[PDB]
Design a protein around this ligand. Structure first.
Ligand code: BEP
Ligand code: BEP
Ligand code: BEP
Ligand code: CA
Ligand code: CA
Ligand code: CA
Length: 149
């Protein structure tokens, strides 16, 4: 909910902002349309249909603008943290190409293709998610990372 968004620390909002920035790369009016959602999806190795992408945009577009702005992105995230389990597993697998149950530094570099976010940002992301210091994020770490401890 809108209010719950204000429970996020200032650092969480910034991190979500960094993620939002990747989606709006080269976007009109800096908001996420089906076009940008399709580009990230494709960069992650998927091949969504127009119906699937439109379904995702409508699910989080609260003002019927047809696009997702940062405020709506935040609410969307707050909502998933506080079905979500399944999307999380798929997302993990999108990064875990060899299916060994880990996301290593190289696999995270997928986010630099056709791209705002930098290698330093990636190595930092890795440190944030890698709790046991083995240079990788396993599924349990990933879930804790995505849900918030
Ligand atoms: C590498 C694969 C294991 C991940 O793809 C799984 C897809 C993702 N979904 C939704 C989704 C998108 C983003 C993040 C998590 C889930 C999907 C839907 C439309 C287009 C591409 C993927 N789900 C489709 C139904 C069950 C599998
Ligand atoms: C997967 C979770 C961490 C966040 O859940 C949001 C995703 C799609 N997101 C994020 C996303 C999209 C593609 C690839 C990775 C993550 C989303 C993003 C932008 C616009 C709309 C939805 N689904 C929410 C319900 C249906 C959509
Ligand atoms: C799931 C999406 C809404 C984006 O989530 C963004 C980041 C890291 N993502 C990076 C990412 C960028 C763009 C699209 C999808 C994901 C991430 C990626 C891989 C492994 C761990 C985190 N999470 C860190 C803690 C909560 C936010
Ligand atoms: Ca909107
Ligand atoms: Ca892997
Ligand atoms: Ca680890």
């Amino acid at each position: 909910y809108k209010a719950a968004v204000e429970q996020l620390t200032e650092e969480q909002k910034n991190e979500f902002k960094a993620a939002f920035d990747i989606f709006v790369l080269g976007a009109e009016d800096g908001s996420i349309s089906t076009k940008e959602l399709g580009k990230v999806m494709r960069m992650l190795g998927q091949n969504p249909t127009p119906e699937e992408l439109q379904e995702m945009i409508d699910e989080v577009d609260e003002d019927g603008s047809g696009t997702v702005d940062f405020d709506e992105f935040l609410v969307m995230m707050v909502r998933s943290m506080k079905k979500s389990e399944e999307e999380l597993s798929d997302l993990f697998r999108m990064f875990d190409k060899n299916a060994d149950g880990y996301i290593d530094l190289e696999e995270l570099k997928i986010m630099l293709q056709a791209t705002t976010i930098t290698e330093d940002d990636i190595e930092e992301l890795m440190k944030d998610g890698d709790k046991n210091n083995d240079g990788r994020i396993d599924y349990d770490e990933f879930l804790e990372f995505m849900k918030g401890v």
